[PDB]
Amino acid sequence: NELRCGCPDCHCKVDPERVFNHDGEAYCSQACAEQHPNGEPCPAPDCHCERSGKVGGRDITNNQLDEALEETFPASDPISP
Numbered sequence: 001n002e003l004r005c006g007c008p009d010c011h012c013k014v015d016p017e018r019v020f021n022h023d024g025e026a027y028c029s030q031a032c033a034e035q036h037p038n039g040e041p042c043p044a045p046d047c048h049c050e051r052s053g054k055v056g057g058r059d060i061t062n063n064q065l066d067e068a069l070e071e072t073f074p075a076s077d078p079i080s081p
């Protein structure tokens with residue numbers, strides 16, 4: 001039932017109670033979750049992952065975001081909890 005880190009170059013135990021997800025993937029920490037965007041390694045002192053793959057400088061981190069409205073506030077408001 002242990003979760004596994006998405007970083008192949010990383011050696012960490014991902015707890016099912018503290019798994020950092022990214023796009024549906026499991027990671028040891030949010031550090032690896034972003035696949036080292038600033039070359040920042042995971043928060044493990046014995047681990048040395050940062051030059052994984054061909055990451056040079058940064059990655060293409062751009063969100064398409066959500067455009068399913070912004071809760072339009074009209075005069076007649078729906079039932080509030």
Ligand SMILES: [Cd+2]
Binds near residue numbers: 007041
């Ligand atoms: Cd690591």
Ligand SMILES: [Cd+2]
Binds near residue numbers: 010012043044
């Ligand atoms: Cd790690």
Ligand SMILES: [Cd+2]
Binds near residue numbers: 006010011012
């Ligand atoms: Cd990791």
Ligand SMILES: [Cd+2]
Binds near residue numbers: 007032036041052
């Ligand atoms: Cd890593």
